[PDB]
Amino acid sequence: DDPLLVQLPQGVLRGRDNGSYYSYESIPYAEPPTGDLRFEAPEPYKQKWSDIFDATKTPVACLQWDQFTPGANKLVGEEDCLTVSVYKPKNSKRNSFPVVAHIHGGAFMFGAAWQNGHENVMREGKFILVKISYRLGPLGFLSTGDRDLPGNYGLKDQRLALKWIKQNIASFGGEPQNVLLVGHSAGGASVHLQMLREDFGQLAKAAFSFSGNALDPWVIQKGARERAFELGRSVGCESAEDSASLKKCLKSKPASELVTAVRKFLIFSYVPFAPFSPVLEPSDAPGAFITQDPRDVIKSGKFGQVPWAVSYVTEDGGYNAALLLKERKSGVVIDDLNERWLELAPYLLFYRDTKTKKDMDDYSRKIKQEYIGNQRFDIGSYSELQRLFTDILFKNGTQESLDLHRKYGKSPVYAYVYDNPAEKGIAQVLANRTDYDFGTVHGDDYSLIFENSVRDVEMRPDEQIISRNFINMLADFASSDDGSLKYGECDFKDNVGSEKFQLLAIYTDGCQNRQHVEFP
């Protein structure tokens, strides 16, 4: 048990030999955020160990209302979930590795470390992986907009895990000076949010945000305060008229009741998909995670100046436009948008809390005209609506992130767009069908790095190559002295100092840097 045992400040833990890698799982990095610690900042884990800690159990998911659990009851996970899991390749020739820290996606509402497979990256064997668990949904992100319930608990959980990695990953054979922080979807937005902290360079050497960034409209949201009291009203806390008594009452309810009440916010299947999300915190809440619009943070230059890459895929908006092609008895769900567009588009595209009712309806009319024209909403116009979702949910925020970083930051900033449709992906799950070519949907690229149950077990020959390319891209990025970035045969071109955007196009059998006034 020489390799299975690891010395931490609290004592020793025992991991598992998996043949090609060692795993040390469910290591707590904070006190359980239960009872009086619900809706509070994470507390550093303080318990000392008298025995050998059993680090052999799969990290539990955070208690969540999981979109992709079928059935009326989508509650899964545990409230006691603040854990890191370390995966180290087995190699008789090599025991020091760079580190990829991983933040799972799931719209800040659901998802889990264990659903992001580590077999692909362990088989390639070029870095240690650390999966971070963090509070989700109302438990991670409920907010009244004041210092009694400021919010962003899940982002503070991630940051404390990042400190844990700095302090302890060398006990596992990791190089703490070579940490690359990566994440997809809400994980990618979280990575960008962590990077926006001024001291982020002390926690990581580099960062990579896949199909998620701090400027996407489902990330930093307005309207949380009323959502918080709306949650209070659904769980028997209608009598609370201020933040402090709302917090007290909410803490008197079982966590499962609070999370189940997420269902009351979902007014069309799983729509809006992020009723709880990051927010701006007030200047008088100590330890606040973010208090300024991230655009103003970037312009100030006062953020972690590390190399960063941000990416999207060409039909990214398949999450979650594809739920509109789900068939019913009466017809197809998208048919309803011919009558309900003004009601639903602000929820689907995340501008219901940032515009007046008049401006909201004008924008709904405007974007429908530009993308759909005079077509009716049906399967024939679905591709144009999916393009609208791709642009507002994912692409526009990528372009604006890249624009602000290339102008106001000195560190290299890179980007790619991926176009290579998977056989199946998240869109077949949302639409419950396989008779429509959705294109390259949210997660088609990232699933090649961390395998999951949504795509095929077997990768096509081209995908096996692309997968190794991505994994090696991340490995080299974590070890890079100069902040350069390379996919396969293509160096990424830095966007700093170029008039046009520099966007690496990755496709089935190659890649090529392209230059754009605006993203295509």
Author numbering: 4 to 523
Give excerpts from the publication:
By far the best characterized ODE for the model insect Drosophila melanogaster is esterase 6 (EST6). EST6 is a member of the carboxyl/cholinesterase (CCE) family of proteins, which is represented by 30–110 different gene/enzyme systems encoding diverse functions in the insect genomes so far sequenced. As such, our biochemical data support the proposition that EST6 is a general, rather than specific, odorant degrading enzyme (ODE), but with a substrate range tuned to various volatile esters with relatively short chain acyl groups that are commonly emitted by the food sources for the flies. We also present a crystal structure for the enzyme which, together with in silico docking studies, supports the kinetic data and shows that its active site can readily accommodate short chain fatty acid esters, including the yeast and fruit volatiles above, but not long chain fatty acid esters like cVA.
After six rounds of directed evolution, the EST6 variant with greatest soluble expression (EST6-1) contained 16 mutations; K15V, V145L, R208K, G229E, N237S, T247A, D290G, I292F, I335V, E383G, S400G, A416V, F450S, F456S, N485D, I511T (note that amino acids are numbered from the first residue of the mature EST6 protein as it would be processed in its native form within the fly and omits the start methionine included to permit heterologous expression in E. coli). Four of these mutations have been found in EST6 from several Drosophila species (V145A, R208K, T247A and I292F). Importantly, the catalytic activity of EST6-1 was very similar to that of EST6-WT, suggesting that the 16 mutations principally affected folding, rather than function, consistent with their being located remote from the active site. We then performed surface lysine methylation, which has been shown to increase the propensity of proteins to crystallize, which yielded crystals in conditions of 0.2 M ammonium acetate, 0.1 M Tris pH 8.5 and 25% w/v PEG 3,350 that diffracted to 2.1 Å resolution. The structure of EST6-1 contains 520 amino acids, 353 water molecules, 32 surface carboxylated lysines and one monomer per asymmetric unit. EST6-1 adopts an α/β-hydrolase fold, including the conserved catalytic triad and oxyanion hole. The active site itself is formed from the catalytic triad (Ser188, His445 and Asp319), oxyanion hole (Gly108, Gly109 and Ala189) and additional residues (Tyr322 Tyr449, Phe450, Asn455, Phe456 and Val457) from a helix after β7 and a loop following β5. The result is a narrower and shorter active site entrance in EST6-1 in comparison to the open and accessible active site in LcαE7 and the deep gorges leading to the catalytic triads in AChE and JHE. The active site volume of EST6-1 is estimated to be 935 Å3, which is consistent with the observed preference of EST6 for smaller substrates than LcαE7.
